[PDB]
Ligand binder design. Structure first.
Ligand SMILES: CC(C)[C@H](C(=O)Nc1ccc(C(=O)NO)cc1)c1ccccc1
Ligand SMILES: [K+]
Ligand SMILES: [K+]
Ligand SMILES: [Zn+2]
Length: 358
């Protein structure tokens, strides 16, 4: 009942980019994570949880029938057909095994949701690829086919009858797919901190700015924290969690926390441009264990430096397992640019959250 679940299957390595041997979204991402968890002795301290394939009905909580059908058909396509389809999307490749792996990727999160919601485990982490947070109702995007966490959130609500789910997205990119899916939904609060640079950084969306707060019944339930300078450090992230995310999370009172656990903000990532120490993720994970009775499930999103991502996963896992948090060399003092972004997000969200008022 107190344990930490871990899901990993070899199927997560069984797809890769057929037309770019240097593609950064590659099978080594997950095998290096598993190898470091093993050598650090963390893997043996976790409860191994089996994966499962998502069902059509589960996919349809988020995705359209037509899109599911098209994705299913990719398993029978030629390489030329896969490339022609992949090129209709932004930042996507395809592979004959992609669909099968994507179904296990979603299902791995659902397995952990089952165990955590029924108190069989305290928390858990799926070491999954493909990632999910960019995937949309009817299209692939950003190396994602299905939106793992969006499905998991609606599954927790439908199956386990959870009323409120908090999704925390600390990947360096905006999870616009999650934002879109829950745009009008007050039962799922989406928080994303991401590099933005006034739209210069991918995916270059105006909707990634803090003015996008959700709409209709969902007004106030979408919170974007855009960084407009590179080089953010641990103290910038800790400060954002302390000033903005935690006060709102406690007011929202979620019954489950899902984390889009990308590690492309870690020092050394080839694209993220940030300078967050892997150890920072021990602290960020610890800061999220205080809501939802500690019912916390992390799922791997991005992170392209094999060592940096593995270290970030290990740091998060140490906190899931209850190990005392490391001391951070860096002082938790944020930079001026981070404070500017945090204050602006608070300004945009204050009408909706009593915890964000004076
Ligand atoms: C051209 C560049 C802007 C583009 C890109 O970087 N996309 C991108 C999308 C999602 C993630 C992610 O999942 N991060 O966690 C990471 C990167 C790209 C496209 C094709 C091959 C390489 C790179
Ligand atoms: K993010
Ligand atoms: K929402
Ligand atoms: Zn990313």
């Amino acid at each position: 009942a107190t344990g930490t679940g871990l899901v990993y299957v070899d199927a997560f390595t069984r797809f890769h980019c057929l037309w770019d041997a240097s593609h950064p979204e590659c099978p080594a991402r997950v095998s290096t994570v598993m190898e470091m968890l093993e050598t650090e002795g963390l893997l043996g301290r976790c409860v191994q949880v089996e994966a499962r394939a998502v069902t059509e009905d589960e996919l349809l909580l988020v995705h359209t029938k037509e899109y599911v059908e098209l994705m299913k058909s990719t398993q029978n396509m030629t390489e030329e057909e896969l490339k022609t389809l992949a090129e209709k999307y932004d930042s996507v490749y395809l592979h004959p095994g992609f669909f099968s792996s994507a179904c296990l990727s979603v299902g791995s999160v659902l397995q952990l949701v089952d165990k955590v919601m029924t108190s069989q485990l305290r928390n858990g982490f799926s070491i999954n690829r493909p990632p999910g947070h960019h995937a949309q109702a009817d299209k692939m995007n950003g190396f994602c086919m299905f939106n793992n966490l969006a499905i998991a959130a609606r599954y927790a609500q439908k199956r386990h009858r959870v009323q409120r789910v908090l999704i925390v997205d600390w990947d360096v990119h905006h999870g616009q797919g999650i934002q879109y899916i829950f745009e009008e939904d007050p039962s799922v609060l989406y928080f994303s901190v991401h590099r933005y640079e006034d739209g210069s950084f991918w995916p270059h969306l105006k909707e990634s700015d803090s003015s996008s707060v959700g709409s209709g019944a969902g007004q106030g339930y979408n919170i974007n924290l855009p960084w407009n300078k590179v080089g953010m450090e641990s103290g910038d992230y800790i400060t954002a969690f302390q000033q903005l995310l935690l006060p709102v999370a406690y007011e929202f009172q979620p019954q489950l926390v899902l984390v889009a656990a990308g590690f492309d903000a870690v020092i050394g990532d080839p694209k993220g441009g940030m300078q967050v120490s892997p150890e920072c993720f021990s602290i960020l994970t610890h800061m999220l264990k205080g809501v939802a009775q500690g019912r916390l499930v992390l799922a791997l999103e991005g992170g392209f430096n094999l060592q940096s991502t593995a270290e970030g996963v290990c740091a998060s896992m140490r906190s899931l397992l209850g190990d005392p948090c490391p001391h951070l060399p860096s002082s938790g003092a944020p930079c001026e640019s981070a404070l500017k972004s945090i204050s602006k997000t608070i300004s945009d969200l204050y009408p909706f959250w009593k915890s964000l008022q004076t």
